[PDB]
Each structure stands twice: as C-alpha cells, then as structure tokens.
C-alpha cells in the first residue's frame, strides 16, 4: 500500500554509489600522490608572457631562454599574468607553482623592521614643523575620512 | 511514511551531487597528470626559407639553426619575421605563434590612466585642440586624410615648465580615446643587458602595429633623447629608425612630453620625425581662474570664494600649485577643524604655496 | 639640477624614473614620501615642485627657546 | 637566498639566486634548520 514499493530501492542504490565514491577518491588519493612525488622541487622560476588559445602559456627562463607550454601545467590560467613568477620543471618546464613576486633584495633592506623608538617630545622646538609633518603623512593614513568630506586630494 | 522515504532520497540527492564534485576533482587530477607528461617548445625567430621545408630559425637568445617545419604547417606564412615554438628534441618548427607581447609592453598599455576628460584640463584649450587634431582625429577619420591625400603628421612634442598639463594632457586623451594606449616612462626604456632597450623600443612599436589603433606616450623623452650612457645613444637610433618606419596607413600616433626640450637632442627636432611642437606655458590669468575653478570645485566650501583675488596673488604658478592652494586650504580646514572651508582658507593657502614657490629656484626655460 | 656641469646621465634617468613615480599618468595615493636635504637651491625645479612634493617643510636654525629646549 | 616562502613554516620553499646561472625554488637537507637560514644570506646549494 505504502512505504512498501520503494524498499528494495533505497537500501541498495545509495550503497552502490557509495562505494562508487569510496572507490573514486582513493583513485584521486592515488593520482594526488602522483602529483606530489612529481612535485620535488627544483624549480626554474621563470616570468610568464602572453597567453594563447591554441589557456597556454609562453615562459621565458632565469637562464633566459623562452619557452612555449603545450598546457600552462598545475596552476590556472585565470591566476596567471604576464611579468609574473611562476615556478616550473627544471627540466620539462611544465609551470607547477605560482610564486610571490620578488623585487629586489636592496629593496627589501630598505624596509624597516626594527621600528625606531625617539619620540615626538624628544624633538624641541620644531612644533610648527613636526605638526606639518604629522597632518600630512599621518593624518592620511589614520582616518581618511576629514578629507574625503572635503574632497580634497590628501598632500 | 513520506519523512524516511525524504531522508534517504536527499541523501542519494546529496550523496550524487558530491559524487559529480568528486568526479571534477578526479578529472582535474587525472588532466594535469597528463599535462605533466606534456614537455615544453622551444621559442625561436625565423629567417630565410632555404627550400620549401628547410627553414633557418634563431632561437630566443640562443644559437642559430637551420631546421624543418614539421609536416603539415603552412610554408607561406612562414616568413622572416614569425615567431615559431621548436620541438626541443630534433628542433623541427611546429606551432608559428603570432608575436612576442613582451609583458614588459604590456604593463605599458594595460595600465589604468585614470578618469580625467577634457572638462578637467583647463587654459589650454588651444593646446587641446592642437593635440586632439593631431592624434585623435587622424585616428578617429582616417579617411579624411585618406581623400585629402595629405600624409598626417606622426607624432607631436610637449614641453614645458614641470607641472603644466603635459602628463594631464596624455591622460586625458588615454582616457577619452577608445583605443589601445601606450605610455612610457622612457627611464623605464633602459635596461643593463646588452642591447636589452633597443629590442624593447622595437617591440614596443611591433606592438603598437600589431594592436591598432594604438597611441605611443614616452614621457620624460630627454631620459633617452639627450644630445649625443653608450646605450642610450645605441638605443635612441634604434627610435629613430622605428619612428621613420612609420607608413601612412598605421593607425599608430606619438607623444613625447618633457621639461627641458633644450637637452633633447636636435635628430628628434628634424621634420618627419616629430614635427608638431606644442608649448605647454604657465597658465595665464583666464587660465589660472580655469584651473583653480576646476580644482577647488568638489570642496565643500561654505559663502563666496575670491577666485580673481587669488588669481591676483598667484603669480607664475604652475597647475599643480593651484592644486596644492586647494591641498593646504582643505588641510588649514581640517586642522582648524572646520567641516567646511571658506576664503580665508584659500588666501592662507595661496600665501603659503607662493612661499613655497619661493623655494622652487625656476630657472628660466628655454625651447628646444 | 638636470643639465648638470656628463656621464651622470645615469643618475638623471634614475631621478626621472623617481619624478613619474610621483606623479604621472597612473595616480600613486597610500604611498606618503619623506624627502631630507640641505641644498634645496641644487634639486631640479622638476621634483621640487608642487605635485610631487605638496609641503615644503623648512628647518630653520633652533632659535633660543628652541636651543634651551634641546639642552 | 631570497624570498623564504614559508607558505606554512612546514614546508619552507626558500628561493635562491645562483649568481651568473639561474635562480631556482629549493629546500634544505636534513642537516640545516630553518632558524638558521634567512632571506639574504648568501646560501650555499648542491650541484645536481
Ligand atoms: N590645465 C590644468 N587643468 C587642471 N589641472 C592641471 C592643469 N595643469 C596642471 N594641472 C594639475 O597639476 C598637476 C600637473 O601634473 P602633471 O604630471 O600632469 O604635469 P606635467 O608638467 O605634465 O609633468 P612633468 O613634470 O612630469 O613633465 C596635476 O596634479 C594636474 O591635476
Ligand atoms: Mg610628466
């Protein structure tokens, strides 16, 4: 009458496809570890220029020499762009990590990480000069909100 | 009944439902596992076609050859002059790609150039009307020169006092052109590798032809157009000869913007290279009101504002002084805590930026 | 100053490359520059201007206040 | 050396700029620790 026309059905069908997908994620398992044994990393971090249709990409090395990529490799195609740093095969130089822009190790020592301590009381006369300095180089970056209700461009 | 019998048949819905997400992840893996088998081409330029299928390639930065295109490729459009990827086994060409972008040249056109139109430049309307007839219009009605048979002019050179409206200009007409834009700084031109700038200025210009219709913007051109360190000069030929490549039909024009024309050297003055000149002078009284009316126009300010008076007090300013008379009225606002501004503001402002300019030691300029 | 005494070219394309990164073409906003010298009457009329460098902050000699202050 | 990636401080990733050859993204050998490396440097790598 009831509940009685779909018993054989849902009992069997939902353990078929679930061992269906126990069955596909160890093959995904095992195709991932594939992946990672080739994923050892010598990597020839090369930029990227333009991409092609025939979603596939042109390399150019740091041993400057160019290459073209049937298939851009492990990244996709929307993250990349041209002039960036990608990571690739040292030998079939597939693309296979997408890498953080790097510009220069000067550049990096002029950055300041030991965040100096003098303080604005340790100045002595200079009030006018020191609140000059502060409304324009502070006052921008703490609120951004007294000069936007002017619509004046901070200096 | 229906509430067990809706368990387990959403149950077999979710259940497919992660079944199809899992089978998209078991295709990602197994399709980049069959990418990595895939091996990378070599990239190469191409030159003399020896016989129908020997073909002598050169290799980006590399040695030169003489190889095969593999069996099936076109041998027309196998000209000197077609980037072609090689098989990095037996070097056959296979794969001719259409030419180099250079991402280099494309930072140079896909940057954002603001949205400053020509109802934001003022005072030099008949600067604007020089520069929107010399390389908007040849663009825009090309067939006008075409039945007019007059061979438009290539490019044209602004100069004049730092902080006129050189860079203004260039961005409003990047802005307002629906085109492809390229801009340079020309410092960024130079580079330490051998022979690097010139095969970017030549690409560059590849590029230009190869995106149509396309505006060339060098500025700072004097960084490497000084009067005749070894690459610079190297690297400005290779400019001229590129510049002198110029057929009429290219849908291609050029500006070049600088502060001391004087230094640029003379080659670049000759006819036929660039030969509309525009002086981009300090703004007159009209202009100087133009400007300041144009700047000052979104603050919030409260009661009449002087402009002439100010106009009056700003002698030999340049644009961006009266930008910064609007800067230091808002910011004397601000500290007075005032959500507003008013003349007094302005006067305080224009007082302390002619101070300012006091400083600015403007040495008198000179044209070319 | 630009023109200057010239194999210093070098140094006037590297301040030019600093003069468009200031202001030129593509605005730079969230990026304050400091600048320090002591012989304002030797820098360009270029990158001592008014959209590069908006405030003009001078230093004079302490005066006697301002010397009791630094004692 | 140059860039210590340290996506996860587990798996470093330090780039390198061999000088005059190339510029790879490598890891440390089992002896050297990641306190003893930092960006700059001046590492010293394998040869194959
Ligand atoms: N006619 C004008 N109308 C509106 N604003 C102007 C005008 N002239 C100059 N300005 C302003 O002054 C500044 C000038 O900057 P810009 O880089 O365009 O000047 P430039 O003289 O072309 O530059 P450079 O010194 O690099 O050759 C900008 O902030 C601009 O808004
Ligand atoms: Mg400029």
């Known amino acids: 009458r009831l509940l009685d026309s779909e018993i054989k059905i849902m009992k069997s069908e ?99 990480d030991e965040r100096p301590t003098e303080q604005y009381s340790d100045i002595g006369g200079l009030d006018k000069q020191i609140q000059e300095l502060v409304e324009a180089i502070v006052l921008p970056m703490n609120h951004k909100e007294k000069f936007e209700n002017l619509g004046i461009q901070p200096p | 009944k229906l509430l067990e019998h809706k368990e387990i048949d959403g149950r077999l819905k979710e259940l497919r439902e992660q079944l199809k997400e899992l089978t998209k992840q078991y295709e990602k893996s ?95 309307s008949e600067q604007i009307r ?139 003055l000759r006819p036929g290279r660039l030969d509309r000149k525009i002086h981009i002078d300090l703004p007159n009284e009209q202009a100087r009101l133009d400007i300041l009316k144009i700047h000052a126009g979104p603050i919030t300010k409260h009661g009449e504002i002087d402009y002439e008076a100010i106009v009056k007090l700003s002698d030999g300013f340049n644009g961006a002084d009266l930008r910064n008379v609007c800067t230091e009225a808002g910011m004397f606002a601000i500290r007075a805590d005032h959500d507003f501004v008013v003349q007094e503001d302005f006067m305080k402002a224009v007082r302390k930026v002619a101070d300012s300019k006091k400083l600015e030691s403007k040495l008198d300029y000179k044209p070319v | 100053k630009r023109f200057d005494s010239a194999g210093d070219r070098e140094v006037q394309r590297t301040m030019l490359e600093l003069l468009n990164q200031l202001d030129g073409f593509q605005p730079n906003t969230q990026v304050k520059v400091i600048a320090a010298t002591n012989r304002v009457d030797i820098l360009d009329p270029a990158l001592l201007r008014s959209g590069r460098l908006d405030r003009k902050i001078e230093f004079p000699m302490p005066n006697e206040e301002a010397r009791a202050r630094i004692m | 050396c140059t860039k210590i990636i340290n996506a996860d401080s587990e798996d470093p990733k330090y780039i390198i700029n061999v000088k005059q050859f190339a510029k790879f993204v490598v890891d440390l050998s089992d002896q050297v620790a990641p306190t003893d490396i930092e960006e700059g440097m001046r590492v010293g790598v394998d040869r194959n």
């Open chain 2, 30 to 124: 197994e399709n980049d596992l069959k990418a990595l088998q895939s091996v990378g081409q070599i990239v190469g330029e191409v030159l003399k076609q020896l016989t129908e299928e020997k073909f002598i390639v050169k290799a980006t930065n590399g040695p030169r050859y003489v190889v095969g295109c593999r069996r099936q490729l076109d041998k027309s459009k196998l000209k000197p002059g077609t980037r072609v990827a090689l098989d990095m086994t037996t070097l056959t060409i296979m794969r001719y790609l259409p030419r180099e972008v250079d991402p280099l040249v494309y930072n140079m056109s896909h940057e954002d150039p603001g949205n400053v139109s020509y109802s934001e430049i003022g005072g030099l």
């Open chain 2, 130 to 268: 020089e520069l929107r007839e010399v390389i908007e219009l040849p663009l825009t009605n090309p067939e006008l020169f075409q039945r007019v048979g007059i061979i438009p002019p290539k490019g044209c050179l602004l100069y004049g006092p730092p902080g006129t409206g050189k860079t203004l200009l260039a961005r409003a007409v990047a802005s307002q052109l629906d085109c492809n834009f390229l801009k340079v700084v020309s410092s960024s031109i130079v580079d330490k590798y051998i022979g690097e700038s010139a095969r970017l200025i030549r690409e560059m210009f590849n590029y230009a032809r190869d995106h149509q219709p396309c505006i060339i913007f060098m500025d700072e051109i004097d960084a490497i157009g000084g009067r005749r360190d070894r690459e610079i000069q190297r690297t400005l030929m290779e400019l001229l000869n590129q510049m002198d490549g110029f057929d009429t039909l290219h849908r291609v024009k050029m500006i070049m913007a600088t502060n001391r024309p004087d230094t640029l050297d003379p080659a670049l």
């Open chain 1, 14 to 112: 939902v353990l078929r496809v679930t061992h269906e997908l126990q069955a596909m994620k160890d093959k995904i398992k095992e195709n991932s570890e594939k992946i990672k044994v080739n994923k050892t990393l010598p990597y020839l971090v090369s930029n990227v220029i333009e991409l092609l249709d025939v979603k596939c990409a042109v390399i150019k090395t740091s041993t400057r020499q160019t290459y073209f990529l049937p298939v851009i490799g492990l990244v996709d195609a929307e993250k990349l762009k041209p002039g960036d740093l990608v990571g690739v095969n040292k030998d079939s130089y597939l693309i296979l990590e997408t890498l953080p822009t790097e510009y220069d190790s000067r550049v990096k020592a002029m950055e300041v």
